[PDB]
C-alpha cells in the first residue's frame with residue numbers, strides 16, 4: 001500500500017550546497033502559507049513556506065520563541081541542550097527579550113561595525129598571508145573561514161583568542177551534536193570556561209562585551225550570572241561558526257557560477273548586492289525558525305492552535321517566486337531585498353551587519369589575493385552538514401597558483 005503522506009519528515013538534508021532539498025522544493029511548490037510536517041520523534045508541526053506569511057508570523061507575538069516550552073518544535077534529540085535554561089534573549093519574548101537584547105546592541109551598531117572594518121581587513125589578510133605562504137592544497141575552513149571570524153568575535157566579546165583551540169572545539173562539538181548527551185557536554189564545557197572568565201573580570205575589569213556585562217549589569221543584579229554565560233555563548237558561537245559557514249558555502253557557490261563571479265571581480269560595487277543575493281540563496285539558518293503558539297492563529301483559512309509548533313523555514317520563503325522572479329536562479333544583480341536569511345521583527349539577527357561586513361571584506365580579499373582560487377575536489381565529494389544544524393561543509397579543499 002502507498003507510503004505517500006501529508007506530513008512529511010522534517011528537516012531534509014541538502015545534497016548540493018546552494019540547492020533546496022527535494023522535499024523543500026515540494027513544500028515551496030505547494031500552495032498555501034503552511035504545511036504539516038512530522039518531526040524526528042513523530043510529533044506533527046507546521047512549517048511556513050511562503051515569504052509574506054513568514055514575515056507576518058515572525059511578527060506575530062502569539063508565536064513565542066520560548067524554547068523551554070514543552071511544545072516547542074525540537075528537530076533533533078540534541079535540542080535538549082538548548083532546551084535547558086537559562087535562555088539567551090534569542091529564546092525570550094517581549095518584554096524580557098528587550099531588556100536583555102539592549103545590554104548587547106551597542107557592540108553591533110552600524111557605527112561600530114564601520115569602525116571594525118580596519119580590524120576585519122587586517123585579520124583577513126593575516127590569515128591569507130599565512131595560508132598563501134604555506135602554498136596549496138589547503139582546507140579553506142580550518143585555515144581561513146573559521147579563524148577569521150573567531151579572532152574578530154573574540155576581541156568584540158573580550159574572550160582571549162589564545163583559548164581558541166578549546167572554545168572552537170567545544171563550539172563545533174555543540175553545532176554538530178546529534179544527541180542530547182554530546183550537546184550538553186559541549187555546552188557545559190563552554191559554560192564552565194565562560195564562568196571562569198567572569199570571575200577573572202571580577203578580579204580585573206577588562207575590555208569586551210563580556211567585561212562590560214560583568215562590570216555593569218551583573219554587578220547590579222540586572223542579569224543573572226548564568227544568563228550572561230548563555231548570552232556570551234550565543235554570541236561566541238554565532239560569531240564564528242555561522243559566519244564561517246557563510247564564507248565556505250559562498251565560495252563554493254560562486255565557483256559553480258563562474259560568469260557571476262567574474263562579473264563580481266570586474267565591478268566591486270556589485271559586492272554588497274552579491275552578499276544579499278548569497279544570503280537569500282544560501283539561507284543557512286533554517287534551524288533558527290522554531291516557534292510555539294500560545295494562542296490560536298488564523299492564517300489564510302488555516303488554523304494554528306495554541307500549543308502547536310511552527311517552524312518558519314526562511315530558506316523556502318527565500319525561494320518564493322512571487323517575491324524573487326525565477327527564485328532558484330542565483331542572480332547577483334537581482335533585487336534580493338526583504339529576504340529572510342536573518343529573520344524579521346524583534347528577533348532579527350543582531351549580528352547581521354557584522355556578517356555582511358565580514359563577507360564583503362572576505363570576498364574582495366579572495367578576489368584580490370587569490371584570483372586563481374578553485375576547489376581541489378569535486379563539489380559532489382564535499383560533506384554537507386544536515387538540516388538539523390547550520391548549513392555548511394566540514395572542510396573545503398582549495399588550490400591556487402602557487
Ligand code: HEM
Nearest residue numbers: 089090235238239246285288341342343347349350351355
Ligand atoms: C550569515 C550569518 C548569520 C545568519 C544567516 C544568521 C541568522 C539568524 C537568524 C535567521 C536569526 C533569527 C532567529 C529567530 O528569529 O529566532 C538570528 C538571530 C540572532 N543572531 Fe544571527 N545569523 C548570522 C550571524 C550572526 C552573528 C555573526 C552574530 C553575532 C553575535 C549573530 C547573533 C544573533 C543573535 C544574538 C540573534 C538573536 C536576535 C534576537 O533574538 O533579538 N548572528 N540570526
Ligand SMILES: CC(=O)N1CCN(c2ccc(OC[C@H]3CO[C@](Cn4ccnc4)(c4ccc(Cl)cc4Cl)O3)cc2)CC1
Nearest residue numbers: 075076078079090174175237238242285287288388389390
Ligand atoms: C535542535 C537541534 O537539532 N540542535 C542541533 C543543532 N544545535 C545547534 C546549532 C547551532 C548552534 O549555533 C549557535 C546558534 C545560536 O542561534 C542559532 C541560529 N543563529 C546563528 C547565528 N545567528 C542565529 C540556532 C541554532 C540552532 C537552533 Cl535549534 C536555534 C538557533 Cl536560534 O545558532 C548551536 C546549537 C543544537 C540543537
